[PDB]
């Protein structure tokens, strides 16, 4: 994205003496609903499913808000031994219809 | 059983199977619940004593067959429903299924039953355990209002009940013999 | 007239969660004055249970105070500790005080006094009748702690060592003690055994034990060149200010308290020697950065997935075997 930005220059004599220092003050205050930024391309969020003490389940939502491109991410998870963990029942759902893994 | 072994090699090549599944039994590992009489105790050991109780514990199995085939050596059928049960009560991780095989042979010694005695408390008994089961380890689980204590005390009642009941079994053998031999 | 050439300091906090918020305000306050009155971090090992400072709770985060007013934090700007919540323990706490530490710790984390040394000792938390208690689990009692300063003696790993506890009957701690050039000091004697309870609205919880209250306000008067002895910290704290009895122990001491400065355990002063000698001198190929997320290298560094089979061997030995044992009950 195309940004821009005021610089201030410490090692300038103008901007900054022995007789006068720096106090830099901004405006800004949250945005209309209209006129706010959109949203990032990618996020993500993790849960646990179930209850009680014996069994559960580890869950994951990523989310591509782009409106027409498709793009791939990597994915790494790591799990302490005592919660063990059955690889047959792994699943990848994408808009209800199943997602093979390039790679795992 | 050499030829067995040496078959299941080839199937992956590797010894590995070896030490996941005898060495599993032998060491008890892994600690999850069962009607059995050692995952409590051993969530609950100090380290100092831990091989000395494994041994005792794995010796107790295989102890009972030599002083048993001194005693029945004239009747091994009889012999061999003792050693199913004692099997099946001291076994590492037992399951109700090794169970239901020595309760299969109660009909072969049904013609015991005079001189059976305190046989109808023990089968209340186990009758009752059976059921508490599920229920304890509900409220334990999944309500949170009991704790491992209460299924502890039933896994104890419930082993006690069995060995009752076969020691019950074994006297009225030979209580039958001894009236056979010297008159009723 | 004292004959040591270095000090060092081992300050140790046993307590933990939020409400025991006391404990470790003390242990802040000792670590404060220690730092003005001239001992470097380098030389102080400090033992925290629990992190009171920056606590989700505090309504005030980096901040520990003494006193409601809040014009005191014993926090302060630079701070450094040694053992974090999970690394506090009596085997550690008796590691570092015998030397029988893990051969990979680092030199910051050792105690490393020798015969010119004196040392400072001080603990907190919550104690009976012979016993001290760390987090809630374990104890350490007073025959062990006997016992391993007797370790530290036959070494000659110390000069003189000052030894100062504040719980409830913590005049027990100090009754085995048996080697030379030892002074200790407690807050209550053996029958007295209850502890004050008055929380501080603003920060929700009980701020600072009384003893060590009054004898950090002792220290903030104390500066680096004071001539103060250690006969004025034996009147510091009089059952009327506090409402328990403070103790002292000093008959395995060799020096007269009244010739013994303050700073000779709580400073560092050092001995100066002017030189006047002096010794003669005579006068083609660019390199390039990885790349993030390679996806076909990646696709490409596994083999594809083929379905598992039983090998050929193995059916052919099994089937083999079974007609084999066919063939004898049969033929
Ligand atoms: C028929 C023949 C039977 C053969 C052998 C008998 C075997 C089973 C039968 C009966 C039981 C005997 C063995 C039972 C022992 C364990 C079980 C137990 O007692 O616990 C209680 C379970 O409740 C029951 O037993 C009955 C409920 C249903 C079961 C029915 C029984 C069988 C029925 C089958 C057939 C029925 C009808 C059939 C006929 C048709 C649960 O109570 P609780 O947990 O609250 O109490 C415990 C504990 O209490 C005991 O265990 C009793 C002690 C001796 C019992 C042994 C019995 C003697 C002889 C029996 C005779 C039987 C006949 C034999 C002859 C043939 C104990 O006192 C405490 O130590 C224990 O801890 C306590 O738990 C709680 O206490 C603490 C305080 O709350 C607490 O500690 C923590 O908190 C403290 C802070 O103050 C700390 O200081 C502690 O460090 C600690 O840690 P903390 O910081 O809190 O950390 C917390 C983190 N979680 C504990 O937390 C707390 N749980
Ligand atoms: C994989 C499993 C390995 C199987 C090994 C392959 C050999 C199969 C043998 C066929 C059964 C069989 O022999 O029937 C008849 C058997 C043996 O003959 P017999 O008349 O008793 O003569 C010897 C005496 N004297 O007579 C008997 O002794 C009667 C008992 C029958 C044995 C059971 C039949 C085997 C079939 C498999 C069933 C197993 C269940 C699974
Ligand atoms: C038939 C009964 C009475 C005993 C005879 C059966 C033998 C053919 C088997 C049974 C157990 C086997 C052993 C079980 C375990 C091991 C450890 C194994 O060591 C490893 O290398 C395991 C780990 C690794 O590969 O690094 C080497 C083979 C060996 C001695 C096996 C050799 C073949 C043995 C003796
Ligand atoms: C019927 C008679 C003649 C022999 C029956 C077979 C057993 C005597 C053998 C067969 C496989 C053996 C096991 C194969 C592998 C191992 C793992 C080996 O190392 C471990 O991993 C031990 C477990 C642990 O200490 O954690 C220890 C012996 C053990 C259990 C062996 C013990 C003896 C076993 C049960
Ligand atoms: C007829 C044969 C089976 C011998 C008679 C039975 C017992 C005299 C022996 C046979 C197999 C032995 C077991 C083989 C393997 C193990 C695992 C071993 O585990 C370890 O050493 C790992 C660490 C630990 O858990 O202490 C402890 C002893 C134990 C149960 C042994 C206890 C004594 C046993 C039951
Ligand atoms: C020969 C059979 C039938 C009966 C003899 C008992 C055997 C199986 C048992 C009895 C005592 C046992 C030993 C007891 C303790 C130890 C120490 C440690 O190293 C683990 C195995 C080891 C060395 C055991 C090996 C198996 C053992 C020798
Ligand atoms: C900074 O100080 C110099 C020298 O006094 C002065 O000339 C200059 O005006 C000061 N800053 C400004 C306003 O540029
Ligand atoms: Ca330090």
Same mark, same amino acid.
């Given at each position: 994205?195309?940004? *821009? $930005?005021?610089?201030?220059?410490?090692?300038?004599?103008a901007?900054?003496?022995?007789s006068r220092?720096?106090?830099?003050q901004?405006?800004?205050?949250?945005?209309?609903?209209?006129?706010?930024?959109?949203?990032?391309?990618?996020?993500?969020?993790?849960?646990?499913?179930? $209850?009680?003490?014996?069994?559960?389940? +580890?869950?994951?939502?990523?989310?591509? *808000?782009?409106?027409?491109?498709?793009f791939?991410?990597? +994915? +790494?998870?790591?799990?302490?031994? $005592?919660?063990?963990?059955?690889?047959?029942?792994?699943?990848?759902?994408?808009?209800?219809?199943?997602?093979?893994p390039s790679?795992? | 059983l050499?030829?067995?072994?040496?078959?299941?090699?080839?199937? =992956?090549?590797?010894?590995?199977?070896?030490?996941?599944?005898?060495?599993?039994?032998?060491?008890?590992?892994?600690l999850?619940?069962?009607?059995?009489?050692?995952?409590?105790?051993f969530?609950?050991?100090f380290? %100092?004593?831990?091989?000395?109780f494994?041994?005792?514990?794995?010796?107790?199995?295989?102890?009972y067959?030599?002083?048993?085939?001194?005693? =029945?050596?004239?009747?091994?059928?009889?012999?061999?429903?003792?050693?199913?049960?004692?099997?099946?009560?001291?076994?590492?991780y037992?399951?109700?299924?090794?169970?239901?095989?020595?309760?299969?042979?109660?009909?072969?010694?049904?013609?015991?039953?005079?001189?059976?005695?305190?046989?109808?408390?023990?089968?209340?008994?186990?009758?009752?355990?059976?059921?508490?089961?599920?229920?304890?380890? %509900?409220?334990?689980?999944?309500?949170?209002?009991?704790?491992?204590n209460?299924?502890?005390?039933?896994?104890?009642?419930?082993?006690?009940?069995?060995?009752?009941?076969?020691?019950?079994?074994?006297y009225?053998?030979?209580?039958?013999?001894?009236?056979?031999? %010297?008159?009723? | 007239r004292?004959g040591?050439?270095?000090?060092? #300091?081992?300050?140790?906090c046993?307590?933990?969660?939020?409400?025991?918020?006391?404990? &470790?305000a003390?242990?802040?306050?000792?670590?404060?004055?220690?730092?003005?009155?001239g001992?470097?971090?380098?030389?102080?090992?400090?033992?925290?249970a629990?992190?009171?400072?920056?606590?989700?709770?505090?309504?005030?985060?980096?901040? &520990?105070?003494?006193?409601?007013n809040?014009?005191?934090?014993?926090?302060?700007?630079?701070?450094?500790?040694?053992?974090?919540?999970?690394?506090?323990?009596?085997?550690?706490?008796?590691?570092?005080l @015998?030397?029988?530490?893990?051969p990979? @710790?680092?030199?910051?984390?050792?105690?490393?006094?020798?015969?010119?040394?004196?040392?400072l000792i001080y603990?907190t938390?919550?104690?009976?009748?012979?016993?001290?208690?760390?987090?809630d689990?374990?104890?350490?009692?007073?025959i062990?702690? #006997?016992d391993?300063?007797?370790?530290?003696?036959?070494?000659?790993?110390?000069?003189?060592?000052?030894?100062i506890?504040?719980?409830?009957?913590?005049?027990?701690?100090?009754?085995?003690f048996?080697?030379?050039?030892?002074? #200790?000091?407690?807050?209550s004697?053996?029958?007295?055994?209850?502890?004050?309870?008055?929380?501080?609205?603003?920060?929700?919880?009980?701020?600072?034990?009384?003893?060590?209250f009054?004898?950090?306000?002792?220290?903030?008067?104390?500066?680096?060149?004071?001539?103060?002895?250690?006969?004025?910290?034996?009147?510091?704290?009089?059952?009327?200010?506090?409402?328990?009895?403070?103790?002292?122990?000093?008959?395995?001491?060799?020096?007269?308290?009244?010739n013994?400065?303050?700073?000779?355990?709580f400073?560092?002063?050092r001995?100066?020697?002017?030189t @006047?000698?002096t010794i003669?001198?005579?006068?083609?190929?660019?390199?390039?950065? #990885?790349?993030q997320?390679?996806?076909?290298?990646?696709?490409?560094?596994?083999?594809?997935?083929?379905?598992?089979?039983?090998?050929?061997?193995?059916?052919?030995?099994?089937?083999?075997?079974?007609?084999? &044992?066919?063939?004898?009950?049969?033929?």
């Open positions: 994205t195309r940004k *821009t $930005y005021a610089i201030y220059d410490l090692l300038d004599t901007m900054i003496n022995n220092n720096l106090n830099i901004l405006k800004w205050k949250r945005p209309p609903e209209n006129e706010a930024p959109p949203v990032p391309f990618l996020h993500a969020q993790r849960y646990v499913s179930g $209850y009680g003490l014996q069994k559960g389940e +580890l869950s994951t939502l990523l989310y591509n *808000t782009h409106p027409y491109r498709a791939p991410v990597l +994915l +790494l998870d790591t799990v302490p031994w $005592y919660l063990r963990l059955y690889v047959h029942t792994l699943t990848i759902t994408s808009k209800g219809k199943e997602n093979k790679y795992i | 050499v030829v067995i072994i040496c078959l299941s090699f080839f199937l =992956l090549s590797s010894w590995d199977f070896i030490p996941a599944v005898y060495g599993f039994i032998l060491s008890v590992p892994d999850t619940p069962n009607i059995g009489l050692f995952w409590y105790f969530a609950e050991m380290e %100092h004593f831990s091989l000395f494994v041994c005792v514990f794995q010796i107790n199995v295989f102890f067959t030599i002083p048993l085939a001194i005693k =029945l050596k004239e009747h091994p059928i009889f012999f061999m429903f003792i050693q199913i049960a004692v099997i099946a009560i001291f076994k590492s037992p399951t109700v299924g090794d169970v239901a095989l020595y309760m299969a042979f109660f009909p072969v010694w049904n013609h015991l039953y005079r001189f059976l005695r305190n046989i109808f408390v023990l089968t209340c008994i186990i009758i009752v355990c059976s059921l508490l089961f599920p229920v304890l380890w %509900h409220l334990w689980i999944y309500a949170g209002s009991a704790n491992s209460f299924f502890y005390a039933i896994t104890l009642t419930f082993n006690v009940g069995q060995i009752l009941l076969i020691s019950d079994y074994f009225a053998f030979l209580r039958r013999e001894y009236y056979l031999t %010297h008159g009723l | 004292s040591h050439t270095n000090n060092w #300091a081992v300050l140790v046993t307590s933990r969660f939020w409400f025991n918020y006391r404990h &470790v003390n242990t802040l306050s000792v670590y404060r004055s220690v730092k003005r009155l001992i470097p971090d380098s030389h102080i090992v400090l033992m925290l629990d992190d009171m400072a920056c606590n989700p709770r505090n309504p005030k985060p980096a901040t &520990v105070f003494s006193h409601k809040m014009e005191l934090n014993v926090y302060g700007d630079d701070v450094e500790v040694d053992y974090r919540s999970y690394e506090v323990t009596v085997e550690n706490f008796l590691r570092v @015998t030397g029988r530490i893990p990979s @710790t680092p030199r910051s984390k050792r105690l490393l006094s020798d015969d010119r040394s004196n040392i603990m938390g919550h104690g009976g009748n012979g016993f001290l208690k760390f987090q689990s374990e104890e350490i009692t007073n062990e702690l #006997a391993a300063f007797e370790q530290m003696w036959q070494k000659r790993r110390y000069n003189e060592l000052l030894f506890i504040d719980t409830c009957q913590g005049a027990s701690m100090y009754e085995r048996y080697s030379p050039n030892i002074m #200790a000091l407690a807050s004697q053996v029958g007295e055994d209850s502890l004050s309870h008055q929380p501080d609205p603003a920060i929700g919880v009980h701020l600072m034990d009384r003893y060590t009054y004898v950090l306000e002792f220290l903030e008067e104390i500066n680096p060149a004071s001539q103060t002895n250690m006969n004025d910290l034996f009147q510091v704290c009089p059952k009327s200010l506090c409402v328990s009895t403070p103790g002292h122990r000093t008959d395995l001491f060799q020096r007269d308290p009244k013994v400065l303050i700073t000779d355990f400073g560092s002063v001995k100066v020697e002017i @006047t000698e003669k001198l005579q006068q083609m190929e660019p390199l390039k950065y #990885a790349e997320l390679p996806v076909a290298q990646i696709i490409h560094q596994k083999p594809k997935l083929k379905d598992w089979h039983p090998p050929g061997g193995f059916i052919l030995g099994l089937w083999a075997l079974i007609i084999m &044992v066919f063939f004898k009950t049969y033929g």
